[PDB]
Amino acid sequence: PTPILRFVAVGDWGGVPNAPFHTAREMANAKAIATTVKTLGADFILSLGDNFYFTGVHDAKDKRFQETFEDVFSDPSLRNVPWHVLAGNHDHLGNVSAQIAYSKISKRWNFPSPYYRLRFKIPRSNVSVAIFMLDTVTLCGNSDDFVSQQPERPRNLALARTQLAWIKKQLAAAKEDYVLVAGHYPVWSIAEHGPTHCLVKQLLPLLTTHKVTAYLCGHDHNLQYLQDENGLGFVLSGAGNFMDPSKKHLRKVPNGYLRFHFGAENSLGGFAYVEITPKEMSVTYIEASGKSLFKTKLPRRA
Numbered sequence: 001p002t003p004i005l006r007f008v009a010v011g012d013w014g015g016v017p018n019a020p021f022h023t024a025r026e027m028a029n030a031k032a033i034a035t036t037v038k039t040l041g042a043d044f045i046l047s048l049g050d051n052f053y054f055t056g057v058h059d060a061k062d063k064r065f066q067e068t069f070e071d072v073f074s075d076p077s078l079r080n081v082p083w084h085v086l087a088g089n090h091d092h093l094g095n096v097s098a099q100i101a102y103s104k105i106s107k108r109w110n111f112p113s114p115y116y117r118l119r120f121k122i123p124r125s126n127v128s129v130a131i132f133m134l135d136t137v138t139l140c141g142n143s144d145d146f147v148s149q150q151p152e153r154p155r156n157l158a159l160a161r162t163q164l165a166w167i168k169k170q171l172a173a174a175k176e177d178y179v180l181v182a183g184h185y186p187v188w189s190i191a192e193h194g195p196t197h198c199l200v201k202q203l204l205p206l207l208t209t210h211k212v213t214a215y216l217c218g219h220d221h222n223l224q225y226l227q228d229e230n231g232l233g234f235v236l237s238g239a240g241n242f243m244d245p246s247k248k249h250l251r252k253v254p255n256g257y258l259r260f261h262f263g264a265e266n267s268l269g270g271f272a273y274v275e276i277t278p279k280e281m282s283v284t285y286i287e288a289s290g291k292s293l294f295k296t297k298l299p300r301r302a
């Protein structure tokens with residue numbers, strides 16, 4: 001059997017603050033993800049931010065952890081599937097330290113710090129994968145802090161410079177066969193929010209220089225796949241709770257980069273299913289309805 005590492009990448013699934021604390025879309029995606037894990041399998045699930053709408057959690061004991069997360073992703077197939085989490089802007093309007101601290105309460109919730117590195121060894125093989133989970137809010141600023149709803153500047157300068165330096169160092173030293181970087185804010189996006197200037201300027205150069213396989217993100221509520229002339233992939237998966245068909249920033253993304261987009265208003269949303277083997281990295285976009293909408297693959301690093 002071909003060695004393989006599999007995981008679900010879902011973003012902006014944070015339900016709602018008012019009863020019942022979830023949306024029809026979040027429930028649909030919970031079911032859809034449970035079906036995919038049940039039939040295709042998944043080693044873990046990656047959350048791309050905006051875990052609890054609209055102002056995160058107050059503390060590690062916030063009832064929202066059970067109402068919006070635990071109780072929602074409760075289907076049998078998801079019982080013991082680990083989640084590796086990072087924060088979004090809405091999470092930062094609340095207590096992120098609380099989401100980090102919740103890791104000690106719920107076994108499947110993994111969120112050791114604002115930004116961290118994940119390392120995986122594809123089973124029955126020597127090919128490795130590294131995933132760098134970033135906190136784009138502390139790095140660029142909280143979009144919610146500005147009327148423009150864009151991260152115009154970080155709240156703390158030392159924190160932002162410190163993370164970037166860490167990214168630079170790590171990406172330079174990374175030797176894995178596959179290197180993924182994940183953050184809430186998008187580098188490229190044709191939707192409502194569009195490209196995050198802070199990431200295009202500070203992160204993208206790094207992604208390129210160090211031949212990262214792909215950048216995974218959420219924030220814009222839809223599904224997109226973009227790839228630049230160097231083959232760098234951009235997996236945007238932020239439709240776990242909402243679906244916005246906005247193409248406002250279509251012209252703000254370099255010509256030809258957009259390879260796939262789905263943001264139908266009537267859709268219940270969707271997510272991305274990543275499969276990594278010694279041969280390649282495949283990314284399948286699946287609608288909450290269970291249907292595959294698009295699939296592509298990325299090569300391993302030299």
Ligand SMILES: *[C@@H]1O[C@H](CO)[C@@H](O[C@@H]2O[C@H](CO)[C@@H](O)[C@H](O)[C@H]2NC(C)=O)[C@H](O)[C@H]1NC(C)=O
Pocket residue numbers: 058059060061095097098101
């Ligand atoms: C953010 O959340 C953290 C974690 O829930 C809060 O810190 C806890 O506060 C209790 C108060 O009784 C302490 O006994 C715990 O030791 C703290 N836990 C940790 C992990 O530090 C914190 O108060 C919250 N901050 C804000 C501003 O709401």
